[PDB]
Amino acid sequence: DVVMTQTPLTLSVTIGQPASISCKSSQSLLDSDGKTYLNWLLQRPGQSPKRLIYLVSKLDSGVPDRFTGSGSGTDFTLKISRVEAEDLGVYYCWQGTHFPLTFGAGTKLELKRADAAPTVSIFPPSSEQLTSGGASVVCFLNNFYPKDINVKWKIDGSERQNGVLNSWTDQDSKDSTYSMSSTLTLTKDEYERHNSYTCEATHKTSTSPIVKSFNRNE
Amino acid sequence: EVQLQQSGPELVKTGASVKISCKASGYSFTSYYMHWVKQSHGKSLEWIGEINPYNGGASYNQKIKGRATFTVDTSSRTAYMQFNSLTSEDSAVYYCARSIYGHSVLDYWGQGTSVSVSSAKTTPPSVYPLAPSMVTLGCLVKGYFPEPVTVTWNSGSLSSGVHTFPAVLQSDLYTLSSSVTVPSSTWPSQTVTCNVAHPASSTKVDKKIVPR
């Protein structure tokens, strides 16, 4: 198989600014018929893959002229003259000169924006879950930027580390923010042996963390 | 408009087979090749093969070891892929794609069919309400298998302030949550309900979020 190597594998772009992806093949993609079957593909979140460029530099009909493809032989480039919000997604180069068709690993393009502090919410276990004998406490850390964030759980003033599962969204296409959920799962019996439950979010937007708590006695 | 409509998500027993379909519309079916492509963990793409719907002739990536078999029904404009002897390594999203003229230049892609390969039984989710300017509510969708689930709020009438978090696997079951943020003047005065569907278990649950 022909190896397709993209660089960089991640882009972080200010809207309006140019960006570029390189693609290098382990073997020339020039055919004996005189054509070079080097292609670019975009997969946006919530969408099917879509064709961007084919035959090195030909634009798909649905693609704006902000995109250009260039290159020859073993070395290829995708350029975006001015990045727009719609450009968020994963870009693949792929070749159809040799059998089998092979794809690069993908370059993930993310957008820059102004720093935003998280909106933090904490939720006790539902009555439904407690009736079943279980207890999940959930913390949302919503609509923040940049990506890096820390969540600390405290129970009755004591830092708690185990039974915590975290999940992070992909960057939002509408506002360029991130969100994260954190779920602490205890037995109902352990849950009921404590009073206060606290979620603490540490983000670059403040020296002090954002603390949300509830008390079972309240 | 060219349309490539693929069949729904599949759970497959380890060692068993799956047959997935791609119904084409908006063009002359026998005039373009159809390709099948695997995408693992939502990232890397691997070509499985192609079929010429005019003559039924297939070509396969040799890395598949002859486990795939492509067919077409020209009368229904459908391409099929049967994939045998599945293991956990074959859990992936499978796409069909059309090429011009055929074989070289893929130009349109189906939406994908998620295939999970596992020894585990299907388990429906437990759906729990998450109740505590703007108020944030949520829905906890716990302990299901396999992916996917779909979550909506107010049957689609609340969409703007909704985030659904990717599922996390722990001890062979998935859990995810969904968040919605509405005006404090809106809830609890107006109803807010999460609607959670899990295709594999034929389950759909509506959970109203009520003040606790």
Residue numbers in the entry:
A (entry chain L): 1 to 27, 27A, 27B, 27C, 27D, 27E, 28 to 213
B (entry chain H): 1 to 52, 52A, 53 to 82, 82A, 82B, 82C, 83 to 100, 100A, ...
Sentences reproduced from the published study:
The urokinase plasminogen activator (uPA) system, comprised of uPA, a specific cell surface receptor for uPA (uPAR), and serpin inhibitors of uPA such as plasminogen activator inhibitor-1 (PAI-1), plays a central role in many of these activities. Recently, we identified and developed a novel uPAR targeted monoclonal antibody that demonstrates robust antitumor effects in a number of different animal tumor models but does not block the binding of uPA to uPAR. In addition, we determined the crystal structures of the ATN-658 Fab fragment alone and in complex with uPAR, the amino terminal (uPAR binding domain) of uPA (ATF), and the somatomedin B domain (SMB) of vitronectin. Moreover, we showed that ATN-658 binding blocks the association of another integrin, α5β1, to uPAR and thus impairs integrin α5β1-mediated adhesion to extracellular matrix. These results suggest a previously unrecognized mechanism by which uPAR may function in tumor progression and a novel epitope for the therapeutic targeting of this receptor.
